[PDB]
Design a protein around this ligand. Structure first.
Ligand SMILES: Cc1ccccc1-n1c(=O)c2c(C)c(C(=O)C3=C(O)CCCC3=O)ccc2n(C)c1=O
Ligand SMILES: Cc1ccccc1-n1c(=O)c2c(C)c(C(=O)C3=C(O)CCCC3=O)ccc2n(C)c1=O
Ligand SMILES: [Co+2]
Ligand SMILES: [Co+2]
Lengths: 368, 372
């Protein structure tokens, strides 16, 4: 008889709602956005460039359900008319030169961005962009998260001002619906948790080689922000190639992971994304004894064909798989997950974040 | 009652064979290469990156017949040489991409001897960019300046490049029919000094041609397989001056990719414009294709003209042959470099420059828009 007790102080210092968007910073946003669109199955739904009147930066929005990926690249400084107020030309090129293609801003929806900005800075956060109202409708603010990644606060009053809608009859959809969590890599986890939880009030989400991890969650546990430190270690290899702290991977949730994985693997060799090598077959015959009450044998058979990892915790089950690095550097990659269980409308973090797969993947290799 | 005479001095100062490859300079070569591979139907052939030992730059080679597109992005200098291409520089790559954006860096041509072609080039006025460097005692590379920040690269073998590994076929890989790069066109503020410079050290002759806002001129090798047109803006709006502003100076404007079948390729490319490929310029009016049976009805049937109207192909004709062509939208953020898809018909003995370069389609499109 085992029981796992979880505690949630709900110590959020301001009102946080949901993940808003993710802003990649590119050198040329057109080719990065068009490739992520075909590989992930995300629709071209908004733009802010020369064709809209923007002479400062080219920004393209891909949407799949609620998930929103923004791809921003700077124009020539000799051409303000920008839509993103915090965008500085020198920062973007310096960001790309030292880190490569990576995530710049992790945006979350708050009831009020300036209040969220004032409480954060008063609780240790280093500011990055002041609260700025746009067309008397949207307010944006940015604070330092880690390295050159910023935590962005978005608030409404009822995509963004300056963006034009894009409607086409393409329409790409592989099943992915929202962003589940965003993980970062830092040298020292202690000072990072002290910092981030210090100004957000996020509580630590309990759990259950080469890394130490901890998950900061919001009151509703829908905004999840894990952080990794190295202890060979893939975390250290990230810090070497990214040159300091940075976002490690974006965990993307889909309403069907089998539908998504089928679409993404078909396109791996024709512009999409490739995946890590699959587990040995002993991993998948040892599944009916581990998760035989949640997945049928056909569904176990579907994971074996698509290289899907399955792990279990105190209350749910997590199907997951990882892609290869998205760009040149062995840095940012994508995680595709589907959470099963915890229906009360579903609890955030249902099934965990796949820590148990480290022991289970190892265990299955000695048998094979 | 009419005839067009063409003179060929054959004044190449060194033996020029054929186009070798085109090197794009990117910020991230992985997302650009997988983009071009899907949109153009080119196969992953060779790589030179971290998985290969290279910690200075990442370079991926896409091939389609004999066409070769190289995409190079700089790694961080903190990973320190192991670079496969000796003329690479992290400072120049970041500076080139910051100044002009995604564009062509090197136009590589195959020659008899790169040590010979470099010495004669500089001796006849060319500005050097990379001395001839024998690599693995098997191939020689040298670079002289061409346009603004575009270099003319000489590739000569002794019997892709050493340092690369052949990428085994991942699948029946992608092939849309594109077989070869026809010509590479650049934009320049003054056609005068550009012609005297380039033709001054190459020895290339002026390939004569048989309103818009440009004055053009085509340089060609003796066999007329390496075609390098140069464009200048005509003022008094011009898409070249627009190019010069956003490109932050001179640079390569477009590349013509010859296809063994232009209808195949256009169907495949247009199939993918909405799903990550390349978009195309708006199609001509329906009166443009109703005017085709009299212009070009002796070489194209009523169905191939019907296939041009559906795919949006431009048809032009000169004294020697015919030309089918179509143009994509700019490949990157800035409206700078785009891609041309052509197929030349006739001039069989196929001659270089068969059908011309579509310069008769400026007035032909205008003559078909002016239809009530
Ligand atoms: C895929 C891979 C390649 C080369 C080195 C390692 C891996 N690798 C992972 O990176 C991996 C991750 C990143 C998670 C994961 O998502 C997760 C973390 O463990 C950090 C805490 C929060 C979180 O969400 C889970 C399982 C993983 N597993 C099982 C795996 O093997
Ligand atoms: C002008 C323009 C504006 C917006 C989109 C498309 C166009 N556009 C072209 O760019 C265009 C080109 C580029 C050629 C062409 O290939 C060419 C030259 O114009 C110069 C001589 C060497 C050469 O190769 C031929 C016809 C063209 N036509 C008919 C056209 O409409
Ligand atoms: Co994760
Ligand atoms: Co052309």
């Amino acid at each position: 008889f085992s029981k796992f007790v979880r505690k949630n102080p709900k110590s959020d210092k301001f009102k946080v709602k949901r993940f808003h968007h993710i802003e990649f910073w590119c050198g040329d946003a057109t080719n990065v956005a068009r490739r992520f669109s075909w590989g992930l199955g995300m629709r071209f739904s908004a733009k802010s460039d020369l064709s809209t009147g923007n002479m400062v930066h080219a920004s393209y929005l891909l949407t799949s359900g609620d998930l929103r990926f923004l791809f921003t690249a700077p124009y020539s400084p000799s051409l303000t008319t920008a839509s993103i107020p915090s965008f500085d030309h020198g920062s973007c090129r310096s960001f790309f030169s030292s880190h490569g293609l990576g995530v710049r801003a992790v945006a979350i929806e708050v009831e009020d961005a300036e209040s969220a900005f004032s409480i954060s800075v008063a609780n240790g956060a280093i500011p990055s962009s002041p609260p700025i109202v746009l067309n008397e409708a949207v307010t944006i603010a940015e604070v330092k998260l880690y390295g050159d990644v910023v935590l962005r606060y978005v608030s409404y009053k009822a995509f963004l001002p300056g963006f034009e809608r894009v409607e086409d009859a393409s329409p790409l959809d592989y099943g992915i619906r929202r962003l589940d969590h965003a993980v970062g890599n830092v040298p020292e986890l202690g000072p990072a948790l002290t910092y981030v939880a210090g100004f957000t009030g996020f509580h630590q989400f309990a759990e259950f080689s080469g890394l130490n991890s901890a998950v900061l969650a919001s009151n509703d546990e829908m905004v999840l922000l894990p952080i990794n430190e190295p202890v060979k270690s893939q975390i250290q290899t990230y810090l070497e190639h990214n040159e300091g702290a940075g976002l490690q991977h974006l965990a993307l949730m889909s309403e069907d992971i089998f539908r998504t994985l089928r679409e993404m693997r078909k396109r791996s060799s024709i512009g999409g994304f490739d995946f890590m090598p699959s587990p040995p077959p002993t991993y998948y015959q040892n599944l009916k004894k581990r998760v035989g009450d949640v997945l049928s044998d056909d569904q176990i058979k579907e994971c074996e064909e698509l290289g899907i990892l399955v792990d279990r915790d105190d209350q749910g089950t997590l199907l997951q798989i990882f892609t290869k690095p998205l760009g040149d550097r062995p840095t940012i990659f994508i995680e595709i997950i589907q959470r099963v269980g915890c229906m009360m409308y579903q609890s955030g973090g249902c099934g965990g974040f796949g820590k148990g797969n480290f022991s289970e993947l190892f265990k299955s290799i000695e048998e094979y």
